[PDB]
Design an enzyme around this catalytic site. Structure first.
Site, PDB file in Angstrom:
ATOM      1  N   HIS A  54      29.693 -16.253  22.090  1.00 15.38           N
ATOM      2  CA  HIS A  54      29.547 -15.193  21.089  1.00 15.38           C
ATOM      3  C   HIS A  54      29.027 -13.920  21.751  1.00 15.38           C
ATOM      4  CE1 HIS A  54      28.715 -14.323  16.578  1.00 15.38           C
ATOM      5  NE2 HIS A  54      28.910 -13.201  17.238  1.00 15.38           N
TER       6      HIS A  54
ATOM      7  N   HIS B  28      29.488  -9.825  22.451  1.00 13.95           N
ATOM      8  CA  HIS B  28      30.060  -8.518  22.174  1.00 13.95           C
ATOM      9  C   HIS B  28      30.031  -7.710  23.451  1.00 13.95           C
ATOM     10  CE1 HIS B  28      29.890  -8.853  17.674  1.00 13.95           C
ATOM     11  NE2 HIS B  28      29.148  -9.870  18.079  1.00 13.95           N
TER      12      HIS B  28
ATOM     13  N   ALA C  80      30.017  -4.328  15.816  1.00 14.74           N
ATOM     14  CA  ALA C  80      29.936  -5.286  14.712  1.00 14.74           C
ATOM     15  C   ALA C  80      30.567  -6.649  14.996  1.00 14.74           C
ATOM     16  CB  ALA C  80      30.566  -4.689  13.474  1.00 14.74           C
TER      17      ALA C  80
ATOM     18  N   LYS D 217      38.900 -13.938  16.716  1.00 14.42           N
ATOM     19  CA  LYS D 217      37.725 -13.827  15.838  1.00 14.42           C
ATOM     20  C   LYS D 217      38.138 -13.334  14.469  1.00 14.42           C
ATOM     21  CE  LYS D 217      33.296 -13.294  14.561  1.00 14.42           C
ATOM     22  NZ  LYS D 217      32.486 -12.387  15.351  1.00 14.42           N
TER      23      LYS D 217
ATOM     24  N   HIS E 225      36.386 -11.971  11.253  1.00 16.52           N
ATOM     25  CA  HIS E 225      35.111 -11.338  10.910  1.00 16.52           C
ATOM     26  C   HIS E 225      35.200 -10.628   9.564  1.00 16.52           C
ATOM     27  CE1 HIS E 225      31.463  -9.026  11.153  1.00 16.52           C
ATOM     28  NE2 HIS E 225      31.172  -9.562  12.321  1.00 16.52           N
TER      29      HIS E 225
ATOM     30  N   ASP F 270      33.842  -8.012   8.489  1.00 15.25           N
ATOM     31  CA  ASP F 270      33.920  -6.551   8.595  1.00 15.25           C
ATOM     32  C   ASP F 270      35.374  -6.059   8.737  1.00 15.25           C
ATOM     33  OD1 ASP F 270      31.138  -6.917   8.557  1.00 15.25           O
ATOM     34  OD2 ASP F 270      30.759  -5.718  10.367  1.00 15.25           O
TER      35      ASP F 270
ATOM     36  N   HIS G  60      33.356 -15.592  11.227  1.00 20.96           N
ATOM     37  CA  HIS G  60      32.235 -15.010  10.491  1.00 20.96           C
ATOM     38  C   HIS G  60      32.820 -14.740   9.103  1.00 20.96           C
ATOM     39  CE1 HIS G  60      29.225 -11.384  10.169  1.00 20.96           C
ATOM     40  NE2 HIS G  60      29.772 -11.598   8.990  1.00 20.96           N
TER      41      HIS G  60
ATOM     42  N   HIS H 147      27.231 -18.407  14.104  1.00 17.44           N
ATOM     43  CA  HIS H 147      25.943 -18.211  13.391  1.00 17.44           C
ATOM     44  C   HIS H 147      25.923 -18.923  12.048  1.00 17.44           C
ATOM     45  CE1 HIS H 147      28.401 -15.078  11.646  1.00 17.44           C
ATOM     46  NE2 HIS H 147      28.316 -14.341  12.738  1.00 17.44           N
TER      47      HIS H 147
ATOM     48  N   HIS I  33      26.037  -3.695  11.440  1.00 17.32           N
ATOM     49  CA  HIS I  33      27.163  -3.663  10.508  1.00 17.32           C
ATOM     50  C   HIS I  33      27.444  -2.294   9.890  1.00 17.32           C
ATOM     51  CE1 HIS I  33      27.863  -7.873  11.108  1.00 17.32           C
ATOM     52  NE2 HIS I  33      26.577  -8.109  10.919  1.00 17.32           N
TER      53      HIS I  33
ATOM     54  N   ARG J 289      21.493 -12.139   3.359  1.00 15.15           N
ATOM     55  CA  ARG J 289      21.679 -12.907   4.572  1.00 15.15           C
ATOM     56  C   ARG J 289      20.402 -13.436   5.196  1.00 15.15           C
ATOM     57  NH1 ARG J 289      26.198  -9.397   7.807  1.00 15.15           N
ATOM     58  NH2 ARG J 289      25.028 -10.316   9.549  1.00 15.15           N
TER      59      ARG J 289
ATOM     60  N   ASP K 193      25.214 -13.752  20.565  1.00 17.53           N
ATOM     61  CA  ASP K 193      25.537 -12.590  19.730  1.00 17.53           C
ATOM     62  C   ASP K 193      25.084 -11.290  20.409  1.00 17.53           C
ATOM     63  OD1 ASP K 193      26.816 -11.409  17.542  1.00 17.53           O
ATOM     64  OD2 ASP K 193      25.564 -12.496  16.046  1.00 17.53           O
TER      65      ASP K 193
ATOM     66  N   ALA L 228      24.709  -7.421  19.174  1.00 14.28           N
ATOM     67  CA  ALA L 228      25.193  -7.287  17.789  1.00 14.28           C
ATOM     68  C   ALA L 228      24.537  -8.370  16.908  1.00 14.28           C
ATOM     69  CB  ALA L 228      26.716  -7.381  17.753  1.00 14.28           C
TER      70      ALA L 228
END
Ligand code: NI
Ligand code: NI
Ligand code: NI
Ligand code: NI
Lengths: 122, 570, 100, 570, 100, 100
Positions: B137, B139, B170, B220, B222, B224, B249, B275, B323, B339, B363, B366
């Protein structure tokens, strides 16, 4: 309760090195004028010419001491040491070029040692 | 002659039955077996054993059972065991685990572990040696993140991003064929293994699949970018054809569905749930129930690991920045707040300890810390020992069962999940020689030496102007494995089978080792080493209480952790 | 010492804060990077002292006031963020509008 | 018109008969001759001489006797002389030493030293210019060691290692074909010339020779790998066939033989004896007697250079770390102690001064300091002038004889020993343009500019954001010669003839200039410039007293050195 | 100034020592890198002062005691090594078991 | 803070000056880089204070005297140059023969 980071807690008992192998005690003398130090894994018959001992008793053997340690002989110093048997294929190559093959070839090893002046060939 | 235990361990590292404390934790690992022959231990240095005609063979050429590298006297900590052995490396791969030296004169030498003219030596006596960490994970936001990862023992980065663009800040996404090509070329200069995830979003197959053909190693999904039933479905259809993994995600907002709708879209297909506790993202409040399912490979990200008294307070602002949310929009704040739940964070500690969450990850940059995956794994294990006791599976007073369960979370399990465990993820014969040496006092905190493809890539080492390498300042530094063209041979770019078949590496001029992603679609929770538990996880929608087998899972946050202020300058 | 990349970088925050504190002590109104450095180092030292994240989120608003800094500096600093090793591991402190 | 001497020297640098102090030492060098024509000196700048139609020729194309680079008004310090000249560079090589400018209007212009449209200018007026240092005892342990070397004027690193592995931390060895290939690729990113030594150990020829064919430039025999009669013999047999040099660190322990046994195994063949005094390794106590023999090329390593009041106290712990020894093993400590002798260190100063030890070297990071070879050479010369007086060979109050004797130790002699003096090691026409400019006040301490293959690679230069390059902070920095693909053209990888014939550079994708090692086996002590003395050296086995020609060689340690606390921030 | 690579690096030992000394002065028990930094900077400043290597090998054992540092820190530090320019050039100081 | 490359580099001049000032305060005659660092940091802090370039060109000759430094150091330093942000932007200060 005190924490020493990364500390060991060793088990009980002791570690026997070179277990099951024949041991031999011999007397060895540094007849030279500078110190000679001998490591745990050198074929004992192939050590410095000026160490005096029964060379035949070093054939196929090495010091019975912990791996990575040594025996030190100051000039003129005589010491008793304990030898153990070599393992694996019981072959030695290189070093002093006395063996280059099986350690079983005692007569050849001693002939070479004598010709080159390694002290203590009978 | 006999040597006492204390002196033996001081000279050669520990042997069978001896225990070692992990850093300043309460965790103790015990040597389970030892491949040596007592008296014929390999060691190197002035007047030592690995010398020509002695422990080093002077006869054989390199191709004749001789090693390029021998790590002497390693205490291996791996999913496969906690044990003492020499490790032999050749052509950049682990070729032997056993006993190295010279069959001329030593008993018990592993036949392909000859120390010869061609052999370099690394002394591992008194060190713990583990596989390099596999972080799935990541970024790709700031190239300075690579050394941060290496310093805490991470050797593979899987994830996505193009730098500090909002999409990448993000989401673990390198979108589309051109961005993927650009980042594959960038990767030529990154001294760590890499795999790149494309955008798992679309309602037609071709826009998604063309990323795989371009060189992506997975996808991925996600929220977003819209974690809709359609994007979920199309991504998994692509993954099943291409044999790559999909990370998810999920829809925190429950906008297009609740958790059950996401599971229905997944339709029993394999997926990696990122996560899984949910602070880092997912169906509020119940996304952690994912980790009970047989087709889910569940990971945690690291800021919730473990539950501490400061955990909750750091999260709101962290989430808002990641985000791209606005403090003046009430629904942005409500989304963020939804969250962040002490109930699920506390339960997450326990689910790790029970083998219900199988993996750790960072992560990085991010909502996660690039250099703390390994660190926080062991802090979690330590907290659980303190609060839950030794696991029932333990014996001899050791924490070996816990240690195998936890080391698996950041080594073998992420490798299995992403279809790369044929190459990396454990200390086994036939795998790439990505190895991390640790002094036990620094275990999980600061790596001593990080070996990549058989050459040291990163090390804690001192003054380059000094007579020896130990004088201050001792700091993490890139080593020769990272320099010149050696960076190409010591690192792997992982890619899809289709991109490899279509010649993408030659097209882009990639010189790194090329690893094939495979066997991703035929696995499940049952394949997660030491962490294979499936169960019904119930999460109360009102109270967020987590139950397994009719039992509430809860624990207290801690005020202090090991592997913390004793070690760090800031 | 075994310094990692962040430990090396964060030394230069402490240094910039020491520089800025000397400038303040000799009577200068502080500028943007000076003000950020002082508040950032304050946070990291607070973590080392064992304060909580919540304590520092609030204390960070009382380190410098508008009369300590140049015109416009308070409005330039929307927040300051810093990570440090607390007794319970690395945590993030966010201080909103640290100078009114 | 006439110009007084002081003003002339201030404008153009010194001329015939003028003297210059080396740094803050008592050593003075005198200009022996000057190639200029007074009144036609070349200089560059606003309203100066090197302008079109004037000192710069505007007619000729680059191929027509025009230079790529002119260093104006250099004071050359070299084994060939101490003298004033312009230096002309073309295609990365020194093509002219003489007088540069424009034959249209100037008298005495060297015909191939035309300043034309194609010519860059470096002003060397007021600078001392030397060849780049040739360090033949380098452990490749930490890549940060390269800038350390460049900053003290070193331009070639010969030695071995794979990074901070114990084998490399003890020995200058890159073992076997695979490690050699890896380090050749690493070398593509190192901004300095490099040659790599293989492991000079084995009892069969093939394991040793395959390293030479793989790309090694020589071999190292080291006692930590077994400096046995067999390893010595096989390595020299290989070297005689391959035309490469062998370096030896002999059997300190006298385990398989005394010094006389090592000499018998060598059997009159050429060999480079490393750290011949013996603190860095070798037959205890008498290894320095090697330096009397006609077939030995003897070097020192730098921590014993020169004998000072703190020298002995630093050595025990240094040695223990380098050779992986244990304080709790009495024989490890005895071995270490046997190597550390004020009697031989004191004699080593004198043997250098007499031209009996021919070379200096670092032993970088393995009982030696990567950036102090040049530094400690001059500190030794200064100490010897103070304690022994000017050498009998001197005249005019200058120290030119000593200066030529000592500069040869770290320039031409190591190059001759390793078979690379056709390329590097002196300021002569036809050699690679590796040149170091020094301000006299910083001579031997901190290099001003280091030119590699005709482009500046390293410089002491200031603020990159400033209006000019002189404002603070002035620090050592890599220059454009190190950037991009220019690193390939400004540096040489030295390799064996066999590896070159077998196409190893193409096989590995090496883009650096490839230098051939040759003419290593047909040389002896007689070929060491200004340091060619053979004699019987007697070392008393009981007292360690060193005698040459019936005379005890001894001197006192000093409490202070020049080139020390006046200059260094730490 | 003509700073070489080591001079640049070693500035950050001095800085880390200054940081650690401030932490000690406000009453904190010092951690591992703090303790190493203080003792290392002490050695390099001692060389600058013109002490001998032998003096510093012994003085280095009396800079910090176990009550100055956290639990386990004394046992974490087997030795400290530092090189600096003495009046007679660069030398190495090794301090064994600096904190009992 | 938004540090640019020069701001990062120039932190280490301030640090070297602090080091040198401590050495001077404990009675040491200063060496070449120490002397350069003190005078350089003096100039950059003077600019921050709002002095003119012309003021600093002259003040820079009165920061250290020959009795503050080792033999030969005054003659080693022909000039010191430093750039800093004055109230009217970046400017260069050149101090000729700062130590007589
Ligand atoms: Ni997420
Ligand atoms: Ni993420
Ligand atoms: Ni050596
Ligand atoms: Ni060496």
């Amino acid at each position: 309760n005190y924490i020493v980071p990364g500390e060991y807690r060793v088990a009980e008992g002791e570690i026997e090195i070179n277990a099951g192998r024949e041991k031999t005690t011999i007397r060895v003398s540094n007849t030279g004028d500078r110190p000679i130090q001998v490591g745990s894994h050198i074929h004992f018959v192939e050590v410095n010419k000026e160490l005096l001992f029964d060379r035949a008793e070093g054939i196929g053997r090495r010091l019975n001491i912990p791996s990575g340690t040594a025996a030190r002989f100051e000039p003129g110093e005589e010491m008793e040491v304990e030898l153990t048997e070599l393992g694996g294929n019981r072959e030695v190559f290189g070093i002093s070029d006395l063996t280059n093959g099986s350690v079983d070839n005692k007569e050849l090893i001693l002939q070479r040692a004598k010709e080159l002046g390694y002290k203590g060939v009978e | 002659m006999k040597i006492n235990r204390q002196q033996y361990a001081e000279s050669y590292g520990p042997t069978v039955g001896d225990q070692v404390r992990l850093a300043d934790t309460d965790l103790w690992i015990e040597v389970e077996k030892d491949y040596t022959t007592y008296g014929d231990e390999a060691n190197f240095g002035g007047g030592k054993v690995l010398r020509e005609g002695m422990g080093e063979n002077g006869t054989y050429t390199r191709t004749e059972n001789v090693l390029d590298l021998l790590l002497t006297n390693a205490l291996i900590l791996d999913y496969t065991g906690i044990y003492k052995a020499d490790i032999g490396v050749k052509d950049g791969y682990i070729v032997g685990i056993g006993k190295g030296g010279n069959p001329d004169i030593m008993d018990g030498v592993t036949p392909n572990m000859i120390v010869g003219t061609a052999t370099e030596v690394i002394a591992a006596e008194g060190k713990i040696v583990t596989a390099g960490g596999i972080d799935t994970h990541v970024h790709f936001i700031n190239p300075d993140q690579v050394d941060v990862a290496l310093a805490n023992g991470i050797t593979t980065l899987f994830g996505g991003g193009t730098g500090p663009a909002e999409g990448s800040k993000a989401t673990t996404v390198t979108p589309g064929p051109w961005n993927i090509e650009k980042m594959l070329k960038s990767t030529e200069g990154l001294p760590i293994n890499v795999g790149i995830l494309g955008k798992g979003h679309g309602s037609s197959i071709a826009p998604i699949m063309e990323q795989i053909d371009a060189g992506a190693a997975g996808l991925k999904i996600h929220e977003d970018w819209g974690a809709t039933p359609a994007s979920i479905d199309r991504s998994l259809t692509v993954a099943d054809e291409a044999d790559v993994q999909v990370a998810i995600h999920s829809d925190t907002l429950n906008e297009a569905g609740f958790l059950e709708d996401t599971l229905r879209a997944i339709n029993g297909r394999v997926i990696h749930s990122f996560h899984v506790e949910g602070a880092g993202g997912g169906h509020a409040p119940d996304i952690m129930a994912m980790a009970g399912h047989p087709n889910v490979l569940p990971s945690s990200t690291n800021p919730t690991r473990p539950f501490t008294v400061n955990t909750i307070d750091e999260h709101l602002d962290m989430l808002m920045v990641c985000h791209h949310l606005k403090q003046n929009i009430p629904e942005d704040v409500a989304f963020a707040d939804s969250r962040i739940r002490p109930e699920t964070i506390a339960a997450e500690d326990i689910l790790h300890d029970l083998g219900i969450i199988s993996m750790m990850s960072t992560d990085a940059l991010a909502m996660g810390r690039a250099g703390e995956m390994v660190l926080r794994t062991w802090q979690t294990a330590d907290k659980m020992k303190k609060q839950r006791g030794p696991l029932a599976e333990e014996k001899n007073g050791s924490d070996n069962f816990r240690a195998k369960r936890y080391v698996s979370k950041y080594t073998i399990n992420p490798a299995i999940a992403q279809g790369i465990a044929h190459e990396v993820g454990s200390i086994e014969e036939g795998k790439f020689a990505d190895l991390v040496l640790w002094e036990p006092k620094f275990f999980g905190v600061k790596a001593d030496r990080v070996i990549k493809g058989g050459i040291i890539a990163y090390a804690q080492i001192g003054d380059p102007s000094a007579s020896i390498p130990t004088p201050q300042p001792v700091m993490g530094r890139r080593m020769y494995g990272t320099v010149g063209d050696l960076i190409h041979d010591t690192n792997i770019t992982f890619m899809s089978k289709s991109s490899i078949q279509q010649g993408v590496p030659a097209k882009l001029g990639l010189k790194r080792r090329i690893g094939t992603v495979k066997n991703c679609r035929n696995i499940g929770k049952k394949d997660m080493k030491w962490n294979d538990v499936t169960t019904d996880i119930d999460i109360n929608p009102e109270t967020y209480e987590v139950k397994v087998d009719g039992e509430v899972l809860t624990c207290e946050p801690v005020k202090e952790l090991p592997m913390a202020q004793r070690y760090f300058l800031f | 010492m075994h310094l990692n990349p962040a430990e090396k970088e964060k030394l230069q925050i402490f240094l910039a804060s020491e520089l800025a504190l000397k400038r303040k002590a000799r009577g200068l109104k502080l500028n943007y990077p000076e003000a950020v450095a002082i508040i950032t180092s304050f946070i990291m030292e607070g973590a080392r002292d064992g304060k909580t994240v919540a304590m520092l989120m609030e204390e960070g608003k009382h380190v410098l006031t508008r009369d300590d800094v140049m015109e416009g500096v308070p409005e330039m600093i929307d927040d300051i963020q810093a990570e440090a090793t607390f007794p319970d591991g690395t945590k993030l402190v966010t201080v909103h509008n640290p100078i009114s």
